[PDB]
Amino acid sequence: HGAGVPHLGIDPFALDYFADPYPEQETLREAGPVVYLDKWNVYGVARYAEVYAVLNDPLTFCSSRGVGLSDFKKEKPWRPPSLILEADPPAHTRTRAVLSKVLSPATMKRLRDGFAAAADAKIDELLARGGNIDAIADLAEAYPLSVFPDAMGLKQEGRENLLPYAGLVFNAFGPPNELRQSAIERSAPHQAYVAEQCQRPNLAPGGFGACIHAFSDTGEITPEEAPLLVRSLLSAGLDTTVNGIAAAVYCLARFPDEFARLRADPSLARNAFEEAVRFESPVQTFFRTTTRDVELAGATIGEGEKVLMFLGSANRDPRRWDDPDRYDITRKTSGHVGFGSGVHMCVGQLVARLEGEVVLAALARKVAAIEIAGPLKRRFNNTLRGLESLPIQLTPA
Ligand code: HEM
């Protein structure tokens, strides 16, 4: 295995790596376009060129064998494969089409005012207590926990267990380590509870959930698939959105001159969030599995091989980005892989962007200055990058 390519001892699932990932991500890029990780016996690609290429060759680098370390072809799935994320065309085309229609631009346009109003109120609220708050619990998590479940049609009370439930999702794409084991145990007590809220009788009319269920009535999807697709949105959208808003606030808080540009021109809100996604990519990695013997950037990769993609690294590859390590809210961000690329490119990106834009717009208008006011605590996850705590001080406009 790994014949003809550079072998490395880098551990992409170690907490030491998660705590300070950039130096090693650079090592991965400089070693070659294709490397082999001896600690896990899997191939890896960290440059923008190859990551983009692989993501856009869904036939060759499939997702139906799992986007995690396990090969669902060779091994009986230890967890049920996602009917959307871990499906290849044409199956994927069918379930994707439903979600794509439900999370359309027209839908976002209808939700915009409500999302903005909630954002403005949240910021006024935070300022009222004083600027001294935790950007994670009080904003990165609080804001989406309000508007996202609302748009989904989930009940108002008991949202306290959505994150505990959602923590399993992306950790499950990693090996059976302590992070994985802890997320499973933390999620267990809420599994049945959250699944129940995704059944048709429990969804508020008009929300994402109810609209998805309507597709059961026509035949596009079965009554059994419907609640699973609904739950997939929650799973795929909670930690990612929290980490996304967290990254944007973290970036603007650490680089005051960029927040100054934003305040001077609030219309940069959407791009400041997009740049935050490129710079501090919520979804750092995940796998694809080869379905045939292939040639990739000079390397020979056999069929049935797991390939680990580093989206964060691709988003900071100097071969593609000028001054990659600089957070620039006016940067031309088009092309970054923070939401992936190709047939699987985040079907929920418009929702995520709406939320992010709206939060940063409220900040740009209501806050005069932002500063980190205490020790930062990073949230460790097998495939995601995020913060557990970020004390900051918001100065009123
Ligand atoms: C900052 C926010 C977000 C980021 C950075 C993000 C990133 C991603 C990435 C990188 C993928 C690709 C996985 C692959 O190719 O295997 C993905 C897929 C997906 N995401 Fe997002 N995500 C975000 C928010 C959301 C939200 C809020 C939702 C729910 C509305 C969501 C629903 C999905 C779904 C359903 C897929 C699978 C699409 C398919 O397989 O066709 N995501 N996301």
Swiss-Prot record:
Named cofactor requirement(s): heme
Main localization, broad class: cytoplasm
Quaternary structure and interacting proteins, as annotated: Interacts with the ferredoxin-like iron-sulfur protein ThcC.
Protein task: The oxidative demethylation of 4-methoxybenzoate requires the participation of the monooxygenase CYP199A2, the ferredoxin-like protein ThcC/RPA1872 and a ferredoxin reductase to mediate the transfer of electrons from NADH to CYP199A2. It is also active with 4-ethylbenzoate.
Localization per Swiss-Prot or TrEMBL: Cytoplasm
Organism: Rhodopseudomonas palustris (strain ATCC BAA-98 / CGA009)
Binding, heme: 346
GO cellular component: cytoplasm
Name under which the protein is recorded: Cytochrome p450 CYP199A2
MF annotations from Gene Ontology: 4-methoxybenzoate monooxygenase (O-demethylating) activity; heme binding; iron ion binding
Keyword terms: Cytoplasm, Heme, Iron, Metal-binding, Monooxygenase, Oxidoreductase
Binding sites annotated in the UniProt record for substrate: 79-82, 232
Catalytically driven reaction(s): 4-methoxybenzoate + AH2 + O2 = 4-hydroxybenzoate + formaldehyde + A + H2O
